[PDB]
Amino acid sequence: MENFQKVEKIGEGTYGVVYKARNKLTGEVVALKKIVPSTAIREISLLKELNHPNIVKLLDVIHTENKLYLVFEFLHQDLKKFMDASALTGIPLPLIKSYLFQLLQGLAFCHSHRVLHRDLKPQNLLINTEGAIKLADFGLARVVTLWYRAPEILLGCKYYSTAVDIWSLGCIFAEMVTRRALFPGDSEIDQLFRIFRTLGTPDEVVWPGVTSMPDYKPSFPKWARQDFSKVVPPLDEDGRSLLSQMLHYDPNKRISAKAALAHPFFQDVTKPVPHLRL
């Protein structure tokens, strides 16, 4: 640690405080996360090899004094701040599409290595001046916001898979378009019920096996599904079709990152430069 000079606190991650810091040696500016079980050390070590342009690079892992520090590449802004900053005007559709495409490329990569994020949220999607967007805190999982949590997690599924990340990204996609959180639940049941109220209460017809799930209750209220035209106006039909697929109840039916990349929505994708005030 003596090799780093703390510049400032850039948030309070789920595991510890994250600091912008300077390598007293190389002079490199990095993000320093202060989080040990051998399993954790080994798992984290694996993440160091998981390199991709849309994944925040984990530079080094430092274990000392039974303490654990993760040194990451530093990015100046996150999607939440950018969304807040662009609230009056909204993020231009072409930039939303570019960001969604890049994130799907990142997910496609991680997923192909059997690595899940599990906690995707605007705060952990980092952006730069070049129009790039990157997933932060990938593989780390293996008040905390429930807004992006997939229904199978909320329903007590113990062995959920990659589809949970597609669900979270579908929620974030909707939020970028509408400028309002899709399902801002403030408790597990409120989260579940917000999802039901919009997509309809799931049943054996649309989600075979849902009624047997651990936290499923026959006493759940039965709400009708709403039309996406009401959910994310004025997103075009291509966008709404993609969204509807990323939000399928059945994790097995939910579109994969790979398939999502081929969706017609991305036929005209480009890479705009955002306007960032750093």
Ligand SMILES: Brc1cnn2c(NCc3cncnc3)cc(-c3ccccc3)cc12
């Ligand atoms: Br790795 C990493 C690399 N950059 N980075 C950023 N940068 C965005 C930023 C935010 N505030 C000031 N400067 C830059 C935020 C978080 C993060 C922090 C807290 C919670 C979740 C993610 C992690 C992280």
